[PDB]
Amino acid sequence: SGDNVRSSAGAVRDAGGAFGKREQAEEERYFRARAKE
Amino acid sequence: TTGRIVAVIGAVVDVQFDEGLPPILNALEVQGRETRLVLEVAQHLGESTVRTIAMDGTEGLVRGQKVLDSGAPIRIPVGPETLGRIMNVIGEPIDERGPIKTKQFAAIHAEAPEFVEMSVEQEILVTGIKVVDLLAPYAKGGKIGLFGGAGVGKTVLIMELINNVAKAHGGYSVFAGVGERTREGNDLYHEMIESGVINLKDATSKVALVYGQMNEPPGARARVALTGLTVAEYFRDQEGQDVLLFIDNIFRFTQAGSEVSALLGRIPSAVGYQPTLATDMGTMQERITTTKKGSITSVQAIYVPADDLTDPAPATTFAHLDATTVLSRAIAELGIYPAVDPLDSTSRIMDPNIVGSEHYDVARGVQKILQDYKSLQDIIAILGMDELSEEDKLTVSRARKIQRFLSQPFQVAEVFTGHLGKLVPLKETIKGFQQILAGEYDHLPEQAFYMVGPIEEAVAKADKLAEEH
Amino acid sequence: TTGRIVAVIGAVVDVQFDEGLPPILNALEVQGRETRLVLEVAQHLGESTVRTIAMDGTEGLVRGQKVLDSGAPIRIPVGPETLGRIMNVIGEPIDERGPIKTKQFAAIHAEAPEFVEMSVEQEILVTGIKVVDLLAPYAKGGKIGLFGGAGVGKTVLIMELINNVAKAHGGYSVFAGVGERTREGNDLYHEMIESGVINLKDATSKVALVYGQMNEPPGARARVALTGLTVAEYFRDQEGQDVLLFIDNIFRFTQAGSEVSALLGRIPSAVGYQPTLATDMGTMQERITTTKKGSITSVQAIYVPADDLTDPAPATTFAHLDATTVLSRAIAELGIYPAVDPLDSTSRIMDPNIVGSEHYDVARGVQKILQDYKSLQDIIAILGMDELSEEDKLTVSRARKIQRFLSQPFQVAEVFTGHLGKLVPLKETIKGFQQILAGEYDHLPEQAFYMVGPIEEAVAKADKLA
Amino acid sequence: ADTSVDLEETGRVLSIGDGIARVHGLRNVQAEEMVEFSSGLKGMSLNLEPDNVGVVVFGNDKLIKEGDIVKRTGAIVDVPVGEELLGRVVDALGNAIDGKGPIGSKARRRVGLKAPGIIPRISVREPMQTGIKAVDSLVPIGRGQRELIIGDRQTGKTSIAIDTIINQKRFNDGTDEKKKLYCIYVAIGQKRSTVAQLVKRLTDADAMKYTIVVSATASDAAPLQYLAPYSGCSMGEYFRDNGKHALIIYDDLSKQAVAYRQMSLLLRRPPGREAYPGDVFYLHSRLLERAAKMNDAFGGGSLTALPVIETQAGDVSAYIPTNVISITDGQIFLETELFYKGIRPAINVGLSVSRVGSAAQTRAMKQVAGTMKLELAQYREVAAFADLDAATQQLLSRGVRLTELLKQGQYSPMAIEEQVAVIYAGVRGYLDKLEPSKITKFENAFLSHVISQHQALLGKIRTDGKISEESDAKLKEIVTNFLAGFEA
Numbered sequence A: 001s002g003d004n005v006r007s008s009a010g011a012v013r014d015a016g017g018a019f020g021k022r023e024q025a026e027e028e029r030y031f032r033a034r035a036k037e
Numbered sequence B: 001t002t003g004r005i006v007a008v009i010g011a012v013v014d015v016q017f018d019e020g021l022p023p024i025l026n027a028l029e030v031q032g033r034e035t036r037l038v039l040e041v042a043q044h045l046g047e048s049t050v051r052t053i054a055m056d057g058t059e060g061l062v063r064g065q066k067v068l069d070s071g072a073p074i075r076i077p078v079g080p081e082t083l084g085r086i087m088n089v090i091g092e093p094i095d096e097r098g099p100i101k102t103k104q105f106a107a108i109h110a111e112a113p114e115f116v117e118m119s120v121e122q123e124i125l126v127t128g129i130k131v132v133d134l135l136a137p138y139a140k141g142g143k144i145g146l147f148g149g150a151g152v153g154k155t156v157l158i159m160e161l162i163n164n165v166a167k168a169h170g171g172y173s174v175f176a177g178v179g180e181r182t183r184e185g186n187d188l189y190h191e192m193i194e195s196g197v198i199n200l201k202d203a204t205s206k207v208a209l210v211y212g213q214m215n216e217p218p219g220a221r222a223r224v225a226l227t228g229l230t231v232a233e234y235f236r237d238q239e240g241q242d243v244l245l246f247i248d249n250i251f252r253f254t255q256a257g258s259e260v261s262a263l264l265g266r267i268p269s270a271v272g273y274q275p276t277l278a279t280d281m282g283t284m285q286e287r288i289t290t291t292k293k294g295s296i297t298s299v300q301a302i303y304v305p306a307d308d309l310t311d312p313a314p315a316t317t318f319a320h321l322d323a324t325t326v327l328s329r330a331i332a333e334l335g336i337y338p339a340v341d342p343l344d345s346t347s348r349i350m351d352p353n354i355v356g357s358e359h360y361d362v363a364r365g366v367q368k369i370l371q372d373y374k375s376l377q378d379i380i381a382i383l384g385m386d387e388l389s390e391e392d393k394l395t396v397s398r399a400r401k402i403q404r405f406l407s408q409p410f411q412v413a414e415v416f417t418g419h420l421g422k423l424v425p426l427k428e429t430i431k432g433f434q435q436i437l438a439g440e441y442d443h444l445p446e447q448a449f450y451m452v453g454p455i456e457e458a459v460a461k462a463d464k465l466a467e468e469h
Numbered sequence C: 001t002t003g004r005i006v007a008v009i010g011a012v013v014d015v016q017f018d019e020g021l022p023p024i025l026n027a028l029e030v031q032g033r034e035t036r037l038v039l040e041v042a043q044h045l046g047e048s049t050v051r052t053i054a055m056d057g058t059e060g061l062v063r064g065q066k067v068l069d070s071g072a073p074i075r076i077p078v079g080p081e082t083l084g085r086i087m088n089v090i091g092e093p094i095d096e097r098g099p100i101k102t103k104q105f106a107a108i109h110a111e112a113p114e115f116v117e118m119s120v121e122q123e124i125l126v127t128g129i130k131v132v133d134l135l136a137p138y139a140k141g142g143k144i145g146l147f148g149g150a151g152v153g154k155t156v157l158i159m160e161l162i163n164n165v166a167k168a169h170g171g172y173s174v175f176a177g178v179g180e181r182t183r184e185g186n187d188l189y190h191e192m193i194e195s196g197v198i199n200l201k202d203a204t205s206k207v208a209l210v211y212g213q214m215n216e217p218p219g220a221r222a223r224v225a226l227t228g229l230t231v232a233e234y235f236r237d238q239e240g241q242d243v244l245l246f247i248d249n250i251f252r253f254t255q256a257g258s259e260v261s262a263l264l265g266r267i268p269s270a271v272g273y274q275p276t277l278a279t280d281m282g283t284m285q286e287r288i289t290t291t292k293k294g295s296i297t298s299v300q301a302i303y304v305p306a307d308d309l310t311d312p313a314p315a316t317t318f319a320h321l322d323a324t325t326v327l328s329r330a331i332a333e334l335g336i337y338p339a340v341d342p343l344d345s346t347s348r349i350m351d352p353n354i355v356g357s358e359h360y361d362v363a364r365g366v367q368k369i370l371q372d373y374k375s376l377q378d379i380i381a382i383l384g385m386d387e388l389s390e391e392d393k394l395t396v397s398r399a400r401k402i403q404r405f406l407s408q409p410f411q412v413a414e415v416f417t418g419h420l421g422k423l424v425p426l427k428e429t430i431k432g433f434q435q436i437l438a439g440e441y442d443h444l445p446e447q448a449f450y451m452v453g454p455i456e457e458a459v460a461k462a463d464k465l466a
Numbered sequence D: 001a002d003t004s005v006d007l008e009e010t011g012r013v014l015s016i017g018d019g020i021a022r023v024h025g026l027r028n029v030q031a032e033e034m035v036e037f038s039s040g041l042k043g044m045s046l047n048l049e050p051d052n053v054g055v056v057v058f059g060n061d062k063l064i065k066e067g068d069i070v071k072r073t074g075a076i077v078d079v080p081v082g083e084e085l086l087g088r089v090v091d092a093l094g095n096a097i098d099g100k101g102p103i104g105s106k107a108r109r110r111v112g113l114k115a116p117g118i119i120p121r122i123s124v125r126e127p128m129q130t131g132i133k134a135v136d137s138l139v140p141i142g143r144g145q146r147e148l149i150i151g152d153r154q155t156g157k158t159s160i161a162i163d164t165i166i167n168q169k170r171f172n173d174g175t176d177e178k179k180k181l182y183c184i185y186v187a188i189g190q191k192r193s194t195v196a197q198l199v200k201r202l203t204d205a206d207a208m209k210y211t212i213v214v215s216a217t218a219s220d221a222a223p224l225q226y227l228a229p230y231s232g233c234s235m236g237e238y239f240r241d242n243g244k245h246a247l248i249i250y251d252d253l254s255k256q257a258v259a260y261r262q263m264s265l266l267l268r269r270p271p272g273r274e275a276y277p278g279d280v281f282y283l284h285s286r287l288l289e290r291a292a293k294m295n296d297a298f299g300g301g302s303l304t305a306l307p308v309i310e311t312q313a314g315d316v317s318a319y320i321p322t323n324v325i326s327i328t329d330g331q332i333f334l335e336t337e338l339f340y341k342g343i344r345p346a347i348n349v350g351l352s353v354s355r356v357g358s359a360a361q362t363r364a365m366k367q368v369a370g371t372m373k374l375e376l377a378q379y380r381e382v383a384a385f386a387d388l389d390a391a392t393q394q395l396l397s398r399g400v401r402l403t404e405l406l407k408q409g410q411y412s413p414m415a416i417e418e419q420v421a422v423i424y425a426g427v428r429g430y431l432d433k434l435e436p437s438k439i440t441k442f443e444n445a446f447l448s449h450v451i452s453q454h455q456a457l458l459g460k461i462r463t464d465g466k467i468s469e470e471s472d473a474k475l476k477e478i479v480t481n482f483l484a485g486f487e488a
């Protein structure tokens, strides 16, 4: 039962989405910063 | 002694003997055929008639046709001269390279090594696969099980295990094709010929081939597993030498038998499998093991119908393994290879007093953060990435990285990924995950850890990633 | 030669012959009986014994009873004098109007047209039903199947199709009642005599009726379809006319087959059915077809036991259809009639090169917005519609007006809808939807598109609502 | 003394029903030997039980009776093979049913021929172009592969095979003998009417002339449908054994499995999972292995198969369905969901793979098709959202564009060079600032332009099957300006 949501569809694509979207910008957000450092 | 065929229904043929009745498990030669046709005595129906499963097609048999009892079970050629040669189910050579002039033949049927014969030694076997060696390490001379639904990576994974461990093996290795694709047999053969693990001009060949693929009637697929096992048996005993045994899909040993059960007159059991499913698998597995005479490092590929691990066939196969690497469509689907499940792959030596405390803690540390991350999969499935305390959303961010760092390019999978297969040393693997769990690389983007070798390339790639932006 | 019954189990009767063994399909007549009792030879058991199937009850039979070999399968009357009459499995009239004096007779068993007799002509058959007309048009000379669960809409639809199509039809029709409600034949019969498609005085009748309702034993219900089928074949071939063949529930033909298969000594297939479900069915459906010699527009009502479309029966029926109209209880329960599934009904005629690109482009517009609304139903049930984008809400809204605009009041159902029947033209249906999609009516309330004919009546009803 | 019926070469029927005949005698028949019935009707002998031979009637069984004489044929079941069948429609045993007369055929081939062992094969390297972008760009097929089309009812399954066959006109009319492909269509449990369109269609695409349609429709006795596949396979093999390449289509192994079950049931062999025989797996694995790429020592020819599997309620996780899947080298999955959304062909990249992958793609296509596949499947990751940030808004900007560029018309296949030209226009981002719904109208205008004014440009890309520098330039020149003139 740990991650049943994700082990399906409807709300999974969402969790999948928000997820990737987040870490998507974040990383770019972290990306240029790498340059700074 | 000569017998006559009295009934032919599929792979099941009835032969009646007037003289003497051959004992069960005895091989019978069907006379009058342009290709040796072996019939294995399966039962004694009574009234001097035995029932047998054909080791080939029955297309053409005639009621009354003669059948010569060879006196014993299927005996095949064993010994060093098999190395480099592709063998049949009944010992026939199928490489068109002529006969296999062997000086000894063993019966593919034999008793399993006694209990007093068991070995209790366990030495981790390093494979270069981070996930494997991290979470569920294989062990020297142990029984390795590779589970997986259709096309998730059983065949590619077992291939990597041969390109990694077999090529650098100081000894012989047996490979048995059990009801798979003949095309894969081609691939493996010519690819072993390239790497030089097989030599066609001399005697340096270090792997023996046994095949009985899909195009083959069940009867054959129902015994080849035992054939290949016999060849590796000789290498384990008559030498003691280290032997590696690769069987691509032992599941075809149980389906084979599931395809002839009824015709052997057997009420079907749960899920249609044979009632004898677990014990047939038992008198078959127990034979594939390390004794005090020598050691077998077996790697079996196990199919999982419709992806259901609870299916009788696979669920009965687990206890026969000392290390299991489970593949997951879900994981493969997230483009992570090998598609190994971190939460369902286990190993007997995964003990702190065998791999040390450092190795163990990190492994469980990986598994835990990955289980916690599954718990947040739900919570964030309705809320979004902006509700988790800075503490939780932090682990989510590490889960992703640890998840991605478990993936790894295979030398054998170049043609697929398009990248250069890497090979990771154990220590570099622990360090690798020890540091990520530490929080060190929380400033690096996840993608930096996806498909790489040691933890370094990660930073390096991460850099190549910073400059490109 | 004389045959004798050696065993009786329900509707399977083993008859042993001492001389001259009747071939398979041959129709045997049981002797010593009040009314004609036919047995159909199904197999040769060996030992000069044949296993047959009764076309009527087998009560009263006694082992040793004599059975005669007619020397031919079940032959029924075919020809113009069948029109306006009602006949049973074995062609006997059951309308209390005396013998049916036809010249020719025909075996109810025959081989299907050969591959060289096949027709490839596709030409829509507009029905006045927006959902069918729109998404899965029926084809003249085509095989239309109407799947539906217990009480969902098959009958009413077949009736409407007889109203909107049969009447404006220039030719002969054949209605085959198979395993359904007898009082329905009663209904049909009297509705036809009214409208006049059946005439009991002048010989102008245009409908031939074959019946073997749910009151009949398995052997009958298992062959009635072939009878109605055979009566349709005469009109098609031996007269070269455009023949309409309605069959209310061909599923009964299969169901029946299962009851007897049991008794025939056949190991059962999946779900208890007979092994021969597929073939048995094929050898029949294949005869229900248009050839080069003539046409047959067949409309078959198909029962879905336990509302399970995967059931071997219906499942196996789709491949035999040129057009499918799938009815849904969930849709019916939302009060949408006809409960046609916009996303599970198909037509080989839904091809732009055939119905035009304007028609095809709208059809796909509708199946796209509904499809997209359907994929949102997961979110709507848990987080309501406040969690949907502005874009989403828009489709949801248009889907709901499209769903409702898909309903329609049929004449044959006025009593349950409380609305006067409606017959919508094709262009009017294309138009009505092109508009709802283009957002042209995004200002009208849902309830305005529900149970109406053209789009114009969607607007009228809107004002009334104010 | 009449000795024409000495129960050695002949037999007498004991019982007959449901297409099953138990024959007394036939003392010399072989397991799986053809037999002749009184009526002139044929059948196969599977059950060599002690007290009889279980014969399965290959046809109408209302002519067979108790006492009817059965005669040995002395031949395991076979069929007429060879290039004479090209352009003809035959039944499962190889008899013409298209009313055009005797089949030339000067050679027969057992329908049960064993499949090539290991040594005779060689890696699948030659492409099998469907002409369908989705396939050729994501699930590329190679000659000798076994790609399985699978899906629910009414989802495109068959159309893929049809667009594939038609697509073969190009090479077959060309000059390069090596790129020619002969196609064998096999209809199982289908409806005659349906097959009629089928062949009226291949005729309107002028593809019948290199196509052997093998048909066993719904009204045909089970064995004919069961045998159908191996019959067409055998025909495909003749080509695969003479330095030629044949593409076979087993239109519906499900129905084939159905018929097989029906036969087995009336032969009295215990039933099993969902009632099929014990060896239903072997039923298909035995047939699909015969598909293969022979090495130069064996002629170097091939036989690629596209068996079509039907699922119910979309359950790729059901018996047969998993039976075949775990056999073929991948699979193309079609879904009803993608069909109504507008994704036709309804190919769900998410589950569609080719275990040949790159191994089966030409230089040029590989170039632009570069990494569009994962990218598309990666667009799906973004698909769950659709105040997007311009960035991700972009990932969602290619996927919506490429998608339209992949849609296509039937009976109008494209030369691999024409496909590269348009795919190029999308993949190189040059159409990212265009209205999706406009893409299709554009491909048309564009193509008709390249094919008109720029015969030579295309004339190259093929010849070199590669997009050279000067060609990457002359194409950027055209899409961007043409496109703009298009958005005037």
Ligand SMILES: Nc1ncnc2c1ncn2[C@@H]1O[C@H](COP(=O)(O)OP(=O)(O)NP(=O)(O)O)[C@@H](O)[C@H]1O
Pocket (backbone or CB within 6 Å): B148, B149, B150, B151, B152, B153, B154, B155, B156, B157, B303, B337, B338, B410, B413, B416, B417, D325, D326, D327, D353, D354, D355, D356
């Ligand atoms: N390590 C890998 N890297 C990339 N792709 C992989 C990898 N392993 C498997 N695949 C992909 O999955 C496909 C086939 O997987 P494969 O190893 O044959 O599966 P399998 O478990 O043996 N399936 P099967 O035996 O048919 O049930 C390949 O063709 C690849 O596309």
Ligand SMILES: Nc1ncnc2c1ncn2[C@@H]1O[C@H](COP(=O)(O)OP(=O)(O)NP(=O)(O)O)[C@@H](O)[C@H]1O
Pocket (backbone or CB within 6 Å): C148, C149, C150, C151, C152, C153, C154, C155, C156, C157, C303, C337, C338, C410, C413, C416, C417
């Ligand atoms: N077009 C319709 N308009 C209004 N109500 C309808 C319509 N179609 C079906 N119904 C309703 O459903 C009921 C019965 O439908 P009916 O035509 O008899 O279904 P059926 O498919 O023939 N089912 P059955 O024969 O019992 O398996 C009617 O009494 C109506 O209440």
Ligand SMILES: Nc1ncnc2c1ncn2[C@@H]1O[C@H](COP(=O)(O)OP(=O)(O)NP(=O)(O)O)[C@@H](O)[C@H]1O
Pocket (backbone or CB within 6 Å): C319, C347, C348, C349, C350, C351, D151, D152, D153, D154, D155, D156, D157, D158, D159, D160, D344, D345, D346, D408
């Ligand atoms: N690319 C396409 N674009 C638009 N329509 C298509 C496309 N491919 C197929 N179709 C249509 O889809 C319908 C049926 O598809 P089809 O090829 O018969 O699928 P199927 O899986 O074989 N169905 P079936 O065998 O009848 O259960 C027909 O109306 C086709 O014209």
Ligand SMILES: [Mg+2]
Pocket (backbone or CB within 6 Å): B154, B155, B180
């Ligand atoms: Mg494999």
Ligand SMILES: [Mg+2]
Pocket (backbone or CB within 6 Å): C154, C155, C180, C248, C301
């Ligand atoms: Mg009804």
Ligand SMILES: [Mg+2]
Pocket (backbone or CB within 6 Å): D157, D158, D159
């Ligand atoms: Mg199809």
